[PDB]
Design a protein around this ligand. Structure first.
Ligand SMILES: O=C[C@H](O)[C@@H](O)[C@H](O)CO
Ligand SMILES: O=C[C@H](O)[C@@H](O)[C@H](O)CO
Ligand SMILES: O=C[C@H](O)[C@@H](O)[C@H](O)CO
Ligand SMILES: O=C[C@H](O)[C@@H](O)[C@H](O)CO
Ligand SMILES: [Mn+2]
Ligand SMILES: [Mn+2]
Ligand SMILES: [Mn+2]
Ligand SMILES: [Mn+2]
Ligand SMILES: [Mn+2]
Ligand SMILES: [Mn+2]
Ligand SMILES: [Mn+2]
Ligand SMILES: [Mn+2]
Lengths: 387, 387, 387, 387
């Protein structure tokens, strides 16, 4: 009873994940830097389907056009040697000090123009390597104090930047869509577009809303104490689940980025149940950090655990949905009824229907138990293999 | 140096606020029930502009049409005697046991039809009494376990219900708009549309989005650790701030509903700064609960404190914005620059502008300090009257 | 592969758990009251070992001595008929309005004397029914505002009350110990002795510290975002784990009291691992509330799930500790070394040991990986039965 | 109406506070390193009384005995030139990779011995420079996973280390006491002794408890959602408030370390009220980080704000306690009664007192209002200078 990933499972990792050196707010790096070529080779051996990158992970900041081309050629040869793909790319608009007050919403206009230029340069590269999605995480957009940022002005600036990127992609005829990734705080005291809901609402005000979706991260919605699977169902309902970041988090605290399955395990089960039942077909991307207590062996074990945990949860959710006893429990809890329209008969029919009010027996309806605890215990039995 | 409210300040209170008997999950009521007529009279004496109600606060559940009319006539006479208005009304779809699994999203179809009928009956009453806004708080919509609610089906049901209410209002020619009020949890384990962002996004999928806005509550966004003034700026940016619920909360815990100004005082200051500077012209509604430790004297002192605290914050934010030293600090922090377009010159101009990339001096830009702490201390000096 | 509880498993429940009518801050009861005799009989049938009670759960507040004796005789006959025991008892010092500002720390001296009298009356009853532990949950001790309670004065009053109860027990020659149960908030804004640590520290200032221990609750330490199993290890380290309250909670929010195993499942696994490995021999008490969505069938299914979940976790933690591959992993992570004294050689020997400083190779030591992720994945494999 | 600090106010700062370069988990330093001599001079000019240090802030890790002496001589001359003192010192047992699994509780025994040696070397230096308090923050003691640390073994190791340090100090005849500083998480997933309560309880198990107290930090207890002033009153009640770390934090999130007065302003007011009324006479130490958005001018403005905010709160709490109207309100809320013994008459007298039970009028007592909201509004009026 083994669970082996194959490239067909669509598992992807950022270069910055297995490549994290372990530098935290309180400590120095515990591991040497990894050459991107080595990460591509090691991930291919574990069964991953591909990798993602920020511009700065692949081409060191400040590289001349000569070194740039060299870094790209070497990477490209590693992808050719292993069959690994690059489904998503993003920009680093958070490390360099110039971004201390943001990229797209920095108060300084000069920095905002620079941020757009750095981004556009990377979209060209992403298209060349075949990415289908371009993510945007505005980690420096926000503030630590109230007077430092007028948020209405900041959203105008954020809209302006995304509308210019949409103009660029359409002008070039590229087949690439954008995915905004929300985070409530860290590194800024409060970050703009803090949750999936805030990001979905913002997209509706862009000039071409169809080019943009969300890239939610498990641990970021949990940093606000929200239900991850409910946020994802809202993103699927809106047709905006363009990409996803998988990891684990233990509650409202700093962003841990533990391997997928760590953190809230029941949430991980319901998330896999939802992705598989809704037919999500994008990459299963892991944005995690092998703890700094680990050496290289531990990095590879942590990345392998990410894939393993998804495969086990996939099997348990499938057995759960397939069990006839569960199907009867879902009927007993009226899941079937939730799926039917409340009033396909229309407004006038509802208004004339005495069974909906005048003669509705509230006490009989109220006495009906929901049977949700029997259903939840079947789900627990299935996750634990005690079924 | 006194701060007296007058009806011109637009301060409103729910009957359920000063009328809360003090029953909590762990204890019996500490105060006798108040007759709505008495609350109208006492609030008019403190300087309030009006009151709001849930159908069940005014007409006891189960009342025959005869008692209904009687409860309304008496209320109407109290409004005439004091000059108090009724700017908002709402429905109780949470107390009666029939609503244990929700109103609009209950799994039982019969309950969902009943919920719509109970709501429609109250919209007619609200219009008769002159309300301009009808709020919807789906406190029972959500779940305690994963299998109990398919959220995509639940959002279809929630959309269906709001679309039918929109059809009803337009069919009757009423001048009333709806305001959805988000809450992340309590009484359900997780509530649907948990934050202002989730509610704004949902409204964009309704058949007539222009009839719906949000009614955010200070304490509810703080229950998710979010920045209230940032959520309100997003609601104003979208043109959807239809009404607001003012109160205080000390962090992520049960919903406290303390008087306005209690809880996060700095957030209260920035919220008042924003409402007044954006020109919000709706009611300043207090949805709070005088602590159960209080007698009737304490209820009235708590409600008076609500208004007083808003008036003091209003004065301090106005002195803050009016101070020439603050105006120079805002320029020093580049608030002026955040308000200017990043690229009014257009995409092609940005792409050809070498000053935005090729010749951008990142190090010089990065070395520029934001001066946000000097600005924040001026704001602190102003709030404390140490300026 | 079934998991049947027997009285030998020591599973206990409060009358107030399966007896919760479902009244919440926002809603009326959804279930009729249960006669204590019926709960005793139903729990005996599910395999429980016993029940616990607050004075007010067994004898309705205000009962004359005649009704009191009657309520006791009936209960006593049900215990005799089923073989159920009563290992713990407690006092209700939170429901009646008189307790609105606390019991032992109320500002009114008269209420504090009354609280002690009500408690003493119940200790006599508890001893008569054979309880070995008397719990104290000061749910009303605390405040919603800063000036309302001087905490140093409040701790003097709390010490005085516990010292008088200790004097009473010793004077009567009773074999009963006290267990203080911490809760950070709810129903008060902030409760005194908010966590296990605060309660252990307070006990050290009592006149006879040996008579007092703690009764930690899973969900209460999680309401402060703390690690439950770490708090329990500290209570075991101090020799103060007198009783325990088992349930589930999903994070920092209102006190949910879900059935045990719900909430943080990994925490539940590590807690069972610790109770069983440390040899905890007290009752396994469930302080939970079957959700108000349930009818009587759902109440009994929820209580049965509590016991089932403990039994499954017990089996998985035992298989985890018994696996030779886990034993080698623990050695690989140096768990063996953590158990050895750092300096049994003494201070002078450590000071003269050049291998501890002057010649310590920090870089070699730092490069050693902890292998914690391999170990954690083995634990995950074991919990899920994927091992 | 100015608030100027003087050395008599006892304001102190760590070298690491104004010296923070701005490196965060997501970004590079934004400011150049400061020479400790320059910080001493600048702080003396702002009115500080002294500075504190970790060994590594003063003498770069790895320095030979020759460079060590040089770093000390230069520092010593700056203290002589300005009249600044050094009231506290501490050890860095968290930055170097060797400490990745902790100092005193690392699984590797060799690292634990090294940690003690590094600490002892610094206690000698601290005594030489005149420190009266030696702080211990075990930031790396804890874990990210359950199996990685047996907590009972870890507490044995932590007790062993503190007992050896106590043996060393007494053996040398030094007049220095230890202060343990709690933090619930960050950098480890969960840190041992997470709150003031956990640290006070642990001290009671040391061989010489009188040598140890706590160094609580505002932002750390708030990271667990706890009430800072209540934790401090418990530490004062126990006679263990040896030192204090002042700063601001906005809720449960990463450790922000904002300047004092930022964060929870009402908590800051009640904390100052308590320190001043209890007569705390130790240093008023600021452990904060000027935001990375700032240049050197902003660093100095942030440090000056720390002192200013304490002085303003000190004035408002003193006016609050001195107001006759407040004194009458405290009597109205029975603060006077909370300070009197509940039963100085003794147990037997309480048991025979019918006024405490048999004839206690619970309904009359329950109807008495606490008048806490009037009292809290007076406190708000006083903090805002609207009084
Ligand atoms: O920009 C980095 C990514 O876009 C993101 O997914 C980070 O790794 C933050 O979660
Ligand atoms: O339905 C009640 C209201 O709509 C709401 O504002 C409540 O008082 C919850 O906050
Ligand atoms: O007083 C009730 C109990 O002592 C306690 O365990 C409650 O059920 C709160 O958790
Ligand atoms: O060890 C550093 C200190 O002891 C501490 O106060 C830190 O600055 C963490 O808060
Ligand atoms: Mn993350
Ligand atoms: Mn991410
Ligand atoms: Mn509320
Ligand atoms: Mn509200
Ligand atoms: Mn509880
Ligand atoms: Mn309990
Ligand atoms: Mn800190
Ligand atoms: Mn500190």
């Amino acid at each position: 009873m083994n669970y082996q990933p194959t490239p067909e499972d669509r598992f992807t990792f950022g270069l910055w994940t297995v490549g994290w050196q372990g530098r935290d707010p309180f400590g120095d790096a515990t591991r040497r830097a990894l050459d991107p070529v080595e990460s591509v080779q090691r991930l291919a051996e574990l069964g991953a389907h591909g990798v993602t990158f920020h511009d700065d992970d692949l081409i060191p900041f400040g590289s001349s056009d000569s070194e740039r081309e060299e870094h790209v050629k070497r990477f490209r040869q590693a992808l050719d040697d292993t069959g690994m793909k690059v489904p998503m790319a993003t920009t680093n608009l958070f490390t360099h000090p110039v971004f201390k007050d943001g990229g797209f919403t920095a108060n300084d206009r000069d920095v905002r123009r620079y941020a757009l230029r750095k981004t556009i340069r990377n979209i060209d590269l992403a298209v060349e390597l075949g990415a289908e999605t371009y993510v945007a995480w505005g980690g420096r957009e926000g503030a630590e104090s109230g007077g430092a940022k007028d948020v209405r002005d900041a959203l105008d600036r954020m809209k302006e930047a995304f509308d210019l990127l949409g103009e660029y992609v359409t002008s070039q005829g590229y087949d690439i869509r954008f995915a905004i990734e929300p985070k409530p705080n860290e590194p800024r005291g409060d970050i703009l577009l803090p949750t999936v809901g805030h990001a979905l609402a913002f997209i509706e005000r862009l000039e071409r809303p169809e080019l943009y979706g969300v890239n939610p991260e498990v641990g970021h919605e949990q940093m606000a104490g929200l239900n991850f699977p409910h946020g994802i169902a809202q993103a699927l309902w809106a047709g905006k689940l363009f990409h996803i970041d998988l990891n684990g988090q233990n509650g409202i605290k700093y962003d841990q980025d533990l391997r997928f399955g760590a953190g809230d395990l029941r949430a991980a089960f319901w998330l896999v149940d939802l992705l598989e039942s809704a037919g999500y077909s994008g990459p299963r991307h892991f944005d995690f950090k092998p703890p700094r207590t680990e050496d290289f062996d531990g990095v590879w074990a942590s990345a392998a655990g990410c894939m393993r945990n998804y495969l086990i949860l996939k099997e348990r959710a499938a057995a759960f949905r397939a069990d006839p006893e569960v199907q009867e429990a879902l009927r007993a809890s009226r899941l079937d009824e939730l799926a039917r329209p409340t009033a396909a008969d229309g407004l006038q029919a509802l208004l004339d229907d005495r069974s909906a009010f005048e003669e509705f027996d509230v006490d009989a309806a109220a006495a009906r138990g929901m049977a949700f605890e029997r259903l939840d215990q079947l789900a627990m039995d299935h996750l634990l293999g005690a079924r």
